[PDB]
Design an enzyme around this catalytic site. Structure first.
Site, PDB file in Angstrom:
ATOM      1  CB  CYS A 149      40.385 -13.982  20.101  1.00 34.99           C
ATOM      2  SG  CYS A 149      39.114 -13.013  20.929  1.00 34.99           S
ATOM      3  CG  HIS A 176      33.436 -12.639  24.942  1.00 40.40           C
ATOM      4  ND1 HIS A 176      33.566 -11.267  24.943  1.00 40.40           N
ATOM      5  CD2 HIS A 176      34.497 -13.117  24.253  1.00 40.40           C
ATOM      6  CE1 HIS A 176      34.702 -10.936  24.357  1.00 40.40           C
ATOM      7  NE2 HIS A 176      35.285 -12.039  23.926  1.00 40.40           N
TER       8      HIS A 176
END
Ligand code: A1D98
Length: 324
Positions: A149, A176
């Site tokens: 991703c 993240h």
């Protein structure tokens, strides 16, 4: 295009949601040896971040059932045992993270599927990122990877920037979230809930595999934080050609409205991470968050839902690989 999904983790489930609504994709089967059908239906129906599935979800002894569609379910630890040939499965989508190499993903072809798409980086399967290098796919390739991703967030932007201005070098930070998937990573074993946790990332190096011209020119790291499953890339690049931030915005917006439509997004609004939950773009450029210090030194900011955009790309790649 008839697909089967191996593994019913978060990626496997969102890929199902997207493939169900894709008109030219038929989900035929699901394999996961660790869950029962009642638990599968539960996990598919409910999602803390992407809402309840907007449809009727149930099960019987052999199926998961979604808006009238019976999806046959299997519990095979060895994917070679799966009736892909009997079920006329075109593409097997492997979302387990354990059959991600050429010789192990082969088990699905061995089982009767015509091709395999791996929803994880591979060391041996060729990696493709939509809007970056999907043109390089050829129909003889039977096993491919959709990369990660984070790579799907970085690579479309790095390509647009490199094509227009040239990237001499770039350092990247990803802020993240706690997304899908501790004695090898000591920091990662600490409590998530109150911590900023530094982490390694190979996303900046893996861009070199799908954009060979950037091989060795990018590296970075991550700070993991306890937020919703939207993350953001912070790319500090040295450019080959002088430019202004206004010019960067026009080039990114032009790519987002044209050749990268649906893959690279663009906003000037005062967004925060939750505004991209369920966004199907791989990369949403945050024009207002970036900052240019000098004509060849800029900080570029791009958001991604680390489950949903990638899962949309997986289904995109499945259709691309099947159209070929
Ligand atoms: C995208 C989701 C994701 O980002 N997973 C992830 C990545 C790194 C770490 C660490 C440390 C934890 C979780 C994805 O799965 O790519 C396929």
């Amino acid at each position: 295009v008839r697909v089967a999904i191996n593994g019913f983790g978060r990626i496997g489930r969102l890929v199902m949601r997207i493939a169900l609504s894709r008109p030219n994709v038929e989900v035929v089967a699901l394999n996961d040896p660790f869950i029962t059908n009642d638990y599968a239906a539960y996990m598919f129906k409910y999602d803390s971040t992407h809402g309840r599935y907007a449809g009727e979800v149930s099960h019987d002894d052999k199926h998961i059932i979604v808006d009238g569609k019976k999806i046959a379910t299997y519990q095979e630890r060895d994917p070679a045992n799966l009736p892909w040939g009997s079920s006329n499965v075109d593409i097997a989508i492997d979302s387990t993270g354990v059959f991600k190499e050429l010789d192990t993903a082969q088990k699905h072809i061995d089982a009767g599927a015509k091709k395999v798409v791996i929803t994880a980086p591979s060391s041996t399967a060729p990696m493709f990122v939509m809007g970056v290098n999907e043109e390089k796919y050829t129909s003889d390739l039977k096993i491919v990877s959709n990369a990660s991703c984070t790579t799907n967030c970085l690579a479309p932007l790095a390509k647009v920037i490199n094509d227009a201005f040239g990237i001499e070098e770039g350092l990247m930070t990803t802020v993240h979230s706690l997304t899908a998937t501790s004695h090898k990573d000591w920091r990662g074993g600490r409590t998530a809930s109150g911590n900023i946790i530094p982490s390694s990332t190979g996303a900046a190096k893996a861009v070199g595999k799908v954009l060979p011209e950037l091989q060795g020119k990018l590296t970075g790291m991550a700070f993991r934080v306890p937020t919703v499953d939207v993350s953001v890339v912070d790319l500090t690049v040295k450019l080959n050609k002088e430019t202004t931030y206004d010019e960067i915005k026009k080039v990114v917006k032009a790519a987002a409205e044209g050749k990268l439509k649906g893959v690279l997004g663009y906003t000037e609004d005062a967004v925060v991470s939750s505004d991209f939950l369920g966004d199907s773009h791989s990369s949403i450029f945050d024009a207002s968050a970036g900052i240019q210090l000098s004509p060849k030194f800029v900080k570029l900011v791009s958001w991604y839902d680390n489950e949903y955009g990638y899962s949309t790309r997986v289904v995109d790649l499945v259709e691309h690989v099947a159209k070929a």
